[PDB]
């Protein structure tokens, strides 16, 4: 029986309307209010376009949804509404639908993002500390609001490097946290899935996002995108084991009385733990400070209960300069 070490009773103490997203009655706006300029992205659940609000002539992002169940769509919407206004949380501006097809679109604020594949390599030591701190503000906020993002990855972190503005986007996989509830482990993305998902531990919590965050952080400081380059879910777990070592994995599995599928156990095998410094090189040396390593190490732990919470992460000495600059 696992539960979150923080914010566990958030949804318990709030009115049922807050988390009972299926009781949501969607209020639709006018679909002609937003004109499509051009496609900018996509997902297996939608098509994303740069658009313009015909009212104020301001930019916006139009996320057109592919056939999706009523329940699933109400969840994303409710979550977006519950979080609207929080630190660095993407803003849902409108909700429209095509009358004939019933194709729904979610209208969001626009961010002049730069492909992380091109942006990250240019980020300075301080830039990394800065943006990660900004992302942390978003995570602690949603967690404090009883919500797990469940899909943290560079692709869901929009960044306008010029304005140094950051937004955590796409809450399509997010869920409300309820103590003891068993969730679907088919969430998050390849490379960023936490061990709990890879070993089928369903009663996970906000800590899942902290593993994803750690993967992101590791890729940034080590200049290796992605950090854990695995193919399928079994392989993804093996890639983690060859770094963190199988001892931690075994201890982890034992603590939660989890038994791996025979085939998987065979693939994982036996591996020793590889120090984080083994990943340092002339390409990333100017980023692998001991503080960076200490922070990373406290994020990438098999045991989700051992990981730093977002609140704790923000106070780590690694961010001391970012904070000092903010508290002034
Ligand atoms: O949930 C969403 C929509 C996010 C809207 C926020 C949002 C804000 N800017 N933005 C940008 N800016 C880039 C064009 C300059 N791209 C995407 N989303 C967004 N892309 C995108 C691509 C695939 C999926 C999603 C979003 N997912």
Residues in CB range of 199: below 8 A, 6 or more apart: 237, 252, 253, 258, 260
Rounded distance between C-alpha atoms, residue 83 and residue 142, angstroms: 7
CATH superfamily placement of domain 20-110: Phosphorylase Kinase; domain 1 (3.30.200.20)
CA dihedral of 85, 86, 89, 93, whole degrees rounded to 10: -10
As for the chain, the residues directly before each break of C–N over 2.5 Å are none
Resolution (A): 2.0
Domain with CATH 3.30.200.20 in the chain: 20-110
- Determine the CATH number of domain 1-19+111-328: 1.10.510.10
Q: Which residues form ligand 1's pocket by a CB distance below 6 Å?
A: 40-43, 48, 50, 61, 63, 90, 108, 110-113, 158, 169-170
List CB contacts of 324: < 8 A, sequence separation 6 or more. none
The set of residues, in sequence order, having a beta carbon less than 8 Å from that of 230 and lying 6+ positions away, is 190, 191, 236, 237, 238, 239, 240
Sign of the CA dihedral 30, 36, 40, 44?
positive
Percentages helix, strand, coil for the chain (3-state, rounded to 5) are 45, 15, 40
| Closest residue to atom 18 of ligand 1, CA basis | 61
* Ligand 1 center–CA 269 separation, angstroms: 40
List every span in the chain annotated with CATH 1.10.510.10.
1-19+111-328
Rounded Cα–Cα distance for residues 61 and 35 (Å)? 10
Q: From the annotation, which residues make up the binding site for ATP?
A: 40-48, 63
Instruction: Please say if 151 is a catalytic residue.
Output: yes
Residue nearest to atom 14 of ligand 1 (CA): 40
Contact yes or no for 15/176 (Cβ under 8 A): no
Identify the residue whose C-alpha is closest to ligand 1 atom 10. 111
Distance between terminal CA atoms of the chain? Answer: 43
Cβ-contact 19, 176 below 8 angstroms: yes
60 CA to centre of ligand 1 in angstroms: 9
Distance (Å, whole) CA 78 – CA 176: 10
* Pick from 86, 223, 50, 88: nearest CA to 164: 88
**Which atom of ligand 1 lies at the shortest distance from residue 90's CA?**
6
Residue from 83, 111, 160 to probe ligand 1 pocket by mutation (most atoms less than 8 Å from CB): 111
Q: How many A from CA of 170 to the centre of ligand 1?
A: 8
Find out whether 83 and 145 touch, Cβ atoms under 8 Å.
yes
- Closest atom of ligand 1 to CA, residue 171: 1
Sign of the CA dihedral 19, 24, 28, 31?
A: positive
Ligand 1 centre from 61 Cα, in Å? 6
CA 156–ligand 1 middle distance (angstroms): 8
Verify cis geometry, omega within 30 degrees of 0, for the bond prior to 226. yes
Catalytically annotated residue among 20, 94, 125, 151: 151
Q: How far is CA 306 from CA 196, 218, 312, in A?
A: 12, 18, 12
In the chain the beta strands, taken as DSSP E runs, fall at 34-43, 46-53, 58-65, 92-97, 104-108, 147-148, 157-160, 165-168, 175-176
In Å, how far are 2, 36, 213, 301, 307 from 289, measured between CA atoms?
33, 45, 18, 19, 20
Q: Which of 57, 172, 167 is closest to 104 using CA atoms?
A: 172
Pick the residue whose CA is nearest to atom 21 on ligand 1. 41
């Amino acid at each position: 029986m696992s539960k979150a070490r923080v914010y566990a009773d958030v949804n318990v103490l709030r009115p049922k309307e807050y988390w009972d997203y299926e009781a949501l009655t969607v209020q639709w706006g006018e679909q002609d209010d937003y004109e499509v300029v051009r496609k900018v992205g996509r997902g297996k659940y939608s098509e994303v376009f740069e658009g313009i609000n015909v009212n104020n002539n301001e930019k916006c992002i139009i996320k057109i949804l592919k056939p999706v169940k009523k329940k699933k769509i109400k969840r994303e919407i409710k979550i977006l509404q519950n979080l609207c206004g929080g630190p660095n949380i993407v803003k849902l501006l409108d909700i429209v639908r095509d009358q004939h097809s019933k194709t729904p679109s979610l209208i969001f604020e626009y961010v002049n993002n730069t492909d992380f594949k091109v942006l990250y390599p240019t980020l300075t030591d301080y830039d990394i500390r800065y943006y990660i701190y900004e992302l942390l503000k978003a995570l602690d906020y949603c967690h404090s609001q009883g919500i797990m993002h469940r899909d943290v990855k560079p692709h869901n972190v929009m960044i306008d490097h010029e304005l140094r503005k950051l937004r955590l986007i796409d809450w399509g996989l997010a869920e409300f946290y309820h103590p003891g509830k068993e969730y679907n482990v088919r969430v998050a993305s390849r490379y960023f899935k936490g061990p709990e998902l890879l070993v089928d531990l369903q009663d996970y919590d906000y800590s899942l996002d902290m593993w994803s965050l750690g993967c992101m952080f590791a890729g940034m400081i080590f200049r290796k995108e992605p950090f854990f380059y695995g193919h399928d879910n079994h392989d993804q777990l093996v890639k983690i084991a060859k770094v963190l070592g199988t001892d931690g994995l075994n201890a982890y599995l034992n603590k939660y009385r989890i038994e791996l599928d025979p085939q998987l156990e065979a693939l994982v095998g036996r591996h020793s733990r590889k120090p984080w410094l083994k990943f340092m090189n002339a390409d990333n040396q100017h980023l692998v400070s001991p503080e960076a390593i200490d922070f990373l190490d406290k994020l990438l732990r098999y045991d989700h209960q051992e990981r730093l919470t977002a609140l704790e992460a923000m106070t780590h000495p690694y961010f001391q300069q970012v904070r000092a600059a903010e508290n002034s």
